[PDB]
Design a protein around this ligand. Sequence first.
Ligand SMILES: N#Cc1c(C(F)(F)F)cc(O)n2c1nc1ccccc12
Ligand SMILES: N#Cc1c(C(F)(F)F)cc(O)n2c1nc1ccccc12
Ligand SMILES: [Ca+2]
Ligand SMILES: [Ca+2]
Ligand SMILES: [Ca+2]
Ligand SMILES: [Ca+2]
Ligand SMILES: [Ca+2]
Ligand SMILES: [Ca+2]
Lengths: 721, 721
Amino acid sequence: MDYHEDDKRFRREELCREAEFLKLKMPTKKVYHISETRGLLKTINSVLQKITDPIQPKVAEHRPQTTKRLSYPFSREKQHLFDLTDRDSFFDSKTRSTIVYEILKRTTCGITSLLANGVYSAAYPLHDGDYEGDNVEFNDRKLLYEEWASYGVFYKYQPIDLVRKYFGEKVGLYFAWLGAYTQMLIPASIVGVIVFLYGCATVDENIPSMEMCDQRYNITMCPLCDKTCSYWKMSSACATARASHLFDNPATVFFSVFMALWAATFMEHWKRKQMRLNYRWDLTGFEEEEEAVKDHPRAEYEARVLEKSWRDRFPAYFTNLVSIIFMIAVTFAIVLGVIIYRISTAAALAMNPSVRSNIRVTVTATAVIINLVVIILLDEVYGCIARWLTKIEVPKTEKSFEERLTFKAFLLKFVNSYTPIFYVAFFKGRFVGRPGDYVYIFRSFRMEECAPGGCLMELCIQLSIIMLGKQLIQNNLFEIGIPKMKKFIRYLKRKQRYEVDFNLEPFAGLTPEYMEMIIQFGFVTLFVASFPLAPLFALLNNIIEIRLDAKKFVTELRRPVAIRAKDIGIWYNILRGVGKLAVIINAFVISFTSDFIPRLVYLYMYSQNGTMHGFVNHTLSSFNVSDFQNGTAPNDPLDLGYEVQICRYKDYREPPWSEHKYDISKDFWAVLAARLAFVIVFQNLVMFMSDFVDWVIPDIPKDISQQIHKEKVLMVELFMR
Amino acid sequence: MDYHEDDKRFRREELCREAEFLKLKMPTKKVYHISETRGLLKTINSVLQKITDPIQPKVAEHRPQTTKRLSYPFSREKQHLFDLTDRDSFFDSKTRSTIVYEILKRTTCGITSLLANGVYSAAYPLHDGDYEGDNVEFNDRKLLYEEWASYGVFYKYQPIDLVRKYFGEKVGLYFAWLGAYTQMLIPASIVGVIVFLYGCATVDENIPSMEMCDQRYNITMCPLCDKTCSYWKMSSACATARASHLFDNPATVFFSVFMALWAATFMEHWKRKQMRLNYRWDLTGFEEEEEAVKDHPRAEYEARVLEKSWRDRFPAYFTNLVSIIFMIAVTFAIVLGVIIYRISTAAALAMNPSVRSNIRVTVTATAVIINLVVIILLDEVYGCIARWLTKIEVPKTEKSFEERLTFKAFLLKFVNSYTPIFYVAFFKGRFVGRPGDYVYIFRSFRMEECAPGGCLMELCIQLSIIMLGKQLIQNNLFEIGIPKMKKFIRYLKRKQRYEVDFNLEPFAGLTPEYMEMIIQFGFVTLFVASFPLAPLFALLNNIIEIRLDAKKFVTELRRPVAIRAKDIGIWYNILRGVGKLAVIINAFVISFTSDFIPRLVYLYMYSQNGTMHGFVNHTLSSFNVSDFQNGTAPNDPLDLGYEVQICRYKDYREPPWSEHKYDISKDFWAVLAARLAFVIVFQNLVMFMSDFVDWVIPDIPKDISQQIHKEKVLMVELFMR
Ligand SMILES: N#Cc1c(C(F)(F)F)cc(O)n2c1nc1ccccc12
Ligand SMILES: N#Cc1c(C(F)(F)F)cc(O)n2c1nc1ccccc12
Ligand SMILES: [Ca+2]
Ligand SMILES: [Ca+2]
Ligand SMILES: [Ca+2]
Ligand SMILES: [Ca+2]
Ligand SMILES: [Ca+2]
Ligand SMILES: [Ca+2]
């Protein structure tokens, strides 16, 4: 109701008696530090905490606690450790909670140790009040709800200063990074939409697509499966080629280069914005060299080692390596099983009406749904096992534990999210053989063939499904519904502020949010040469996500402790690494799965006339149907208006009427050399461009540096006077 | 003789009267700062300078001047700004000279401005005394001469602390970097010698070299020139192939990878050593943001702009770009002229005894000598023009001027030093055509053909000549003789210390020394896949160079002002960039000029038997001598024991008895694809390995950080007590 209580100790109301004694001595050991009050609740009982005014300077002066001073050159209050202040209430409640948390966790007895032991089942600060109500006291929580956490203010700049003041520099840094990411995604989305519009405009005049779509010509392709399917006409995939043209053209290559430059520019812009926010909030980077607080399990391990009698973690490290390798192998095996799923389901379904008319979408849709559900469960399981792996290695400090767990979880999430996309982009229909000599996995299954029109369309469909159904629909819906579902379950199985805050969901951390954003960034950067509009989908998802996260923080979760951070941490390194890998991934996508290199090679060496006419005939090689290997020919030749004597396919192999029939032709080697040369040139040039963009743009803006120098001069002048 | 004089103003003894007045007011404006004495010399007159004891704390306290304090935990005197001291003589004479230089250059009137105007023709501090003599006072100069500057102490560690104390942190940092470079080059030299020994041992069992050396077989090669030369037997270049085998093999590829890793490790080791030296000497990185001293020409330009009425340097920038492009074009044109030199000289010489028996060495030796002399003169001219280019742009501060001049000079020196080597390695005999269709430069000259045995041997010979005759013999001899020559010229056209120091050569700077070392590093790293023993030659040159530079500093040059530096500066960035480019250069050398890829391709696709037999026949293509283009056949067919009907050559072209005779074969495209794939794989893997080496090794050693933390704790404890 009405008080100034600064923290909330919560314990299970009642060996049971032995555990009760532990919580009777900790408050006694902090009686002279913090004055508490006991609340005899009705359900589980709860304990209040209060910090007195004199204790504030004693603990606020233990470490440098900058506070805004009186002088304000250029309307900027000076931040000084301890110069002069008054009114005995200038501390923000977040700062009071942070000081109280320092007092609790610095005790010898530690709040973390007893929380782990289970004597205390909860501990949190309180919100300033209710975010919604009738004529409420006009707290900062309601201000954030109305001004920042509403879905109707999705277009306006977020009050980042108020967010940092209420929740701390950590959540504030996360939201500032999210806003900068969305703002940078805006122009990239515009350019991608322009590229897509250019492709749509040019699709009608595309010579290869027109040649593929010509129904006057009769081009018969070999079957994509042994006996389930038969010969198909090249014109049957006219829509696929026209759709594909919108995703591979010179505009797409230009957009890939533009997105590499955009990633570099976004990195530089985030560096500058982070420096600006540090100058605005706090620039005291001096901290203990991991000597502030030590991990209690680490302390117990050290005590055990000393009682018995670094580098003793080797069995843990080997276990971590083995577990990670096993996880990656399991993910690859699940991908292989999904591959085997599509082959068996397609063959069985065709043997059965409407089922044989929708074999493509029915097999692909069910496979996609199965993969998405399986990898959701895999993400949960791998997060838990990464928790365990980081626990067993026993990091010395909490910061190292968070660092290593974040690295492991990001690696596992990267593998699970990008394995099927990498497979479809590179290795889907590449390792098969000629129609007379196929390759079978487990000598029972023909592995995989690209859909009529190439595997680029499949990659585009997969990317669209992943970034719309999963990242935009399923993920956000799960985020909204999981806290509500758990609250409803808890309910199934006036009021004081501490009680209502206790009913709120505990804060989990910024790791899942950063993980989602980094995965989306990887989607935007790694796969953009073959798929424009990825920045547009990311922009829409981020527009929803800013308000979703703000609402979750304001209304659902408990108030975090609001510890200090000046950097996003390992996430910047992860972003830089993903951006660096995006250059190689984009180069390989353009060279091997884009079909752009073969068109250039044909135009500049085999065109003769100098145009693109005859490219489809050039890329298609003839095969004699009589050379099928006794059980691979179509079970029922359709015989639409003829009998197939020679079926066409695209492998760059010499014709049956040659001495070296079905062997790799010179055109294959020339096109492969062109692909490799383009990969080399693209990678080197894009890396040089990114390095140039990094080098030209200064890390710290000159204005911030000059303002810092002027502030230091003024502060030293005041100090000596 | 005997005094404590701390600086030496020197002026031309006598508008002349107007200039004399300028030097009469500067000492008056510093009478209260520095007490001078006038020396009425006999030749040109000279002025002494002295700084009093009270002025030392006034100027030493203007900026943080750390001095070793009394406390010494772990035998380490504490470095503090101003805590307590005594004896009134604890300042080193180098520190006294630095303080005096600060006093002189901070005056408004500035010593730099009047030195530029010409009123003062010289200004320097004095050496502690004579480095050699009979029962001399045992100064630090003689200690450095005996202990560090002698050629007989080439094997011992240099007294880097004494060098830094006498000459300052700048020369000390240069010499520490040189010593670390030599120490790192030692193991690399050992591994390279081992690789060379492996090649020498294996050369007898090399199947391709044995096949080339077989005199039983009769393989006739097409002439390498139109009419000057005739058909030659493949066995005539047996020595060339055997010598080449020592420079291209799996050991050479392993050594290229090892040298990439070694460059990364050397960068990390230098970073750690630099941090250690900073901790030992000075860690006060706080300095003015280019606000300490402004360039006098920049001030004059700003005053002119303000009187008339950033980004006004655009005509200067355009001039700089045009001049740099013109310089690079001139260097490339000189390379082209050297190319045209060899063609014309070879043809003319053969038309003439002994001349026709030594056409190869005579043409190549004279061409190499001409190129070396021309590029020496080019280096001098380009250094002067880079001086002018940096002057015209008017850098705001001296540090920016030095930075930009160093960048321009390094770029020009890189171009001049590496243009011929790059040409010989990549573009020498690559752009010629088939024997029936050659390509002529200016339609008068057949451009260039690789010597019998490949262009790898020519590259190895060029590298050996460059790193032995030029970098080791010519460069060191010129360094030793130029100061002696100038001193002898000055002489042709008891004594006080200032006079003898005046006779000494003025200090030029560390830029030429760093430039030589960086060029040698580029030689060691960029071209090492095709040439082992490069680290060995670099190690020998550095062993000579350490003592040569020490002797030059101790005995020849005047004592530098000994300004402070904590980093080598732009040279670290240049080294990192050269190392990064070395990966790509090594990959291209291995793939295109090493002949390693074709051997693998033949062994794994065309070998059949699985061995290397028949590789030489595979790489050689037949040509019908009747297809010469009417003036390209040999003028005099030698007819040793037969008449040539078909001459062989290596171009991967189909034989005359085929329908597509002389066209590019499938083997050419396959080998090109293999080369490009190897380039991609090598570049990516080596970049990842270098990044891993950088990431694993911490930049600052933990010992230095913990010692700094302990020192800070002790200092704060003493400060509060
Ligand atoms: N989404 C999606 C997928 C699509 C398509 F985009 F067209 F719908 C096609 C496809 O072959 N695969 C997809 N996911 C896969 C996972 C493992 C193996 C193959 C996989
Ligand atoms: N040194 C050296 C050179 C050698 C060799 F090593 F064999 F001696 C061979 C060679 O063709 N060239 C050399 N320098 C060149 C500069 C420009 C053009 C060609 C050049
Ligand atoms: Ca989401
Ligand atoms: Ca989220
Ligand atoms: Ca930068
Ligand atoms: Ca030298
Ligand atoms: Ca030198
Ligand atoms: Ca490092």
